[PDB]
Write an enzyme that holds these catalytic residues in place. Sequence first.
Site, short mmCIF file in Angstrom:
data_model
loop_
_atom_site.label_atom_id
_atom_site.label_comp_id
_atom_site.label_asym_id
_atom_site.label_seq_id
_atom_site.Cartn_x
_atom_site.Cartn_y
_atom_site.Cartn_z
N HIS A 42 0.81 -1.25 0.00
CA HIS A 42 0.00 0.00 0.00
C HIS A 42 0.81 1.26 0.00
O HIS A 42 0.32 2.31 -0.16
CB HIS A 42 -1.07 0.09 1.10
CG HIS A 42 -0.60 0.60 2.43
ND1 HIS A 42 -0.27 -0.22 3.47
CD2 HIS A 42 -0.51 1.86 2.92
CE1 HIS A 42 0.02 0.50 4.54
NE2 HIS A 42 -0.10 1.77 4.22
N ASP A 91 -6.31 -3.27 -2.48
CA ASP A 91 -6.19 -1.93 -1.93
C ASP A 91 -7.39 -1.45 -1.10
O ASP A 91 -7.32 -0.38 -0.48
CB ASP A 91 -5.88 -0.91 -3.05
CG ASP A 91 -5.32 0.42 -2.51
OD1 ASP A 91 -5.45 1.45 -3.21
OD2 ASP A 91 -4.74 0.44 -1.40
N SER A 191 4.25 2.26 8.32
CA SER A 191 3.87 1.23 7.35
C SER A 191 5.04 0.67 6.59
O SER A 191 5.93 1.42 6.17
CB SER A 191 2.90 1.78 6.33
OG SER A 191 1.65 2.08 6.92
N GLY A 192 5.04 -0.65 6.39
CA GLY A 192 6.10 -1.25 5.62
C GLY A 192 7.27 -1.73 6.45
O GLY A 192 8.04 -2.58 5.99
N1 LIG Z 1 -11.11 5.56 7.88
C1 LIG Z 1 -9.86 5.95 7.60
N2 LIG Z 1 -9.63 7.17 7.33
C2 LIG Z 1 -8.73 4.96 7.53
C3 LIG Z 1 -8.65 3.77 8.28
C4 LIG Z 1 -7.55 2.90 8.14
C5 LIG Z 1 -6.52 3.21 7.24
O1 LIG Z 1 -5.43 2.38 7.06
C6 LIG Z 1 -4.17 2.93 6.84
C7 LIG Z 1 -3.90 3.66 5.67
C8 LIG Z 1 -2.65 4.22 5.45
C9 LIG Z 1 -1.68 4.02 6.42
N3 LIG Z 1 -0.38 4.38 6.44
S1 LIG Z 1 0.46 5.35 5.55
O2 LIG Z 1 1.77 5.52 6.14
O3 LIG Z 1 -0.27 6.47 6.05
C10 LIG Z 1 0.42 5.60 3.96
C11 LIG Z 1 -0.69 6.14 3.29
C12 LIG Z 1 -0.63 6.38 1.91
C13 LIG Z 1 0.54 6.09 1.22
C14 LIG Z 1 0.63 6.33 -0.15
C15 LIG Z 1 1.82 6.04 -0.82
C16 LIG Z 1 2.90 5.54 -0.12
C17 LIG Z 1 2.81 5.31 1.24
C18 LIG Z 1 1.64 5.59 1.91
C19 LIG Z 1 1.59 5.36 3.27
C20 LIG Z 1 -1.96 3.31 7.55
O4 LIG Z 1 -0.91 3.19 8.42
C21 LIG Z 1 -1.13 2.78 9.70
C22 LIG Z 1 -2.13 3.41 10.45
C23 LIG Z 1 -2.37 2.99 11.74
C24 LIG Z 1 -1.63 1.94 12.27
C25 LIG Z 1 -1.86 1.47 13.66
N4 LIG Z 1 -2.75 2.03 14.45
N5 LIG Z 1 -1.17 0.49 14.05
C26 LIG Z 1 -0.63 1.31 11.52
C27 LIG Z 1 -0.38 1.73 10.22
N6 LIG Z 1 -3.19 2.76 7.76
C28 LIG Z 1 -6.63 4.40 6.50
C29 LIG Z 1 -7.71 5.25 6.64
#
Ligand SMILES: N=C(N)c1ccc(Oc2ccc(NS(=O)(=O)c3ccc4ccccc4c3)c(Oc3ccc(C(=N)N)cc3)n2)cc1
Length: 241
Positions: A42, A91, A191-192
Amino acid sequence: VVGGTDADEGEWPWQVSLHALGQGHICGASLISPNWLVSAAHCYIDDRGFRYSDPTQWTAFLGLHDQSQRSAPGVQERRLKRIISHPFFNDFTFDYDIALLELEKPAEYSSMVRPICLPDASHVFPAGKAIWVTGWGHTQYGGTGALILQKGEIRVINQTTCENLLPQQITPRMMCVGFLSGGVDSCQGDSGGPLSSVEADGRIFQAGVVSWGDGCAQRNKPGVYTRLPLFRDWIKENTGV
Ligand SMILES: N=C(N)c1ccc(Oc2ccc(NS(=O)(=O)c3ccc4ccccc4c3)c(Oc3ccc(C(=N)N)cc3)n2)cc1
């Protein structure tokens, strides 16, 4: 990482920072051989303004400690030759959230750059085990990223409990790790990156990949991670590792 502490320099020499050109740190990754990193799928999705799926748009920093000191002694900068996202990555559900990144030039092993061990397909990381999450992500939900690499100790949660906490969202590729009371969790920008687990003789194995969560560090909302044993063969088939 929410509820964590500064890592010591060189404490997680497999932890890698991925920067997208002109954007700074976006995701983590883990070094698994001289030529390969593990990360989350992602992180490499295009959006109307940037082609995150294009390997040429990235830079990996190995041996990094502080985001403001990327040229410090021991830090290695590398470009990517290819991004192999799992073919079953979804996704919308984030099922199969794992990718393999091929370095354009091999990493040079040093005290600050060292691969993490991969677990065999049959290995079970048991419920209750303490494991570590590391990264430069936000230190509070909606907060700001950390300049200095953070570490946090979290515990594997029972899968049935996980499925019940996040209904209709947890697949068998996922694992909840954290605490039902919250407090310590990964967050945006982590992430990652790898979950690091201390095994029987002290060697560290990768238990999973930081994937997603509902908020960060909230009660009854532990972070969700992609499991690693399930992908041991896929990694071998695609990388030779
Ligand atoms: N309802 C919402 N707004 C929602 C809910 C869940 C989502 O899930 C995501 C989406 C993107 C992310 N992460 S990320 O770092 O934000 C991210 C998002 C978009 C990217 C695009 C290109 C390249 C890298 C990107 C990275 C995410 O990360 C998390 C969030 C929370 C935790 C945790 N509490 N442990 C761990 C990792 N989680 C995202 C959005």
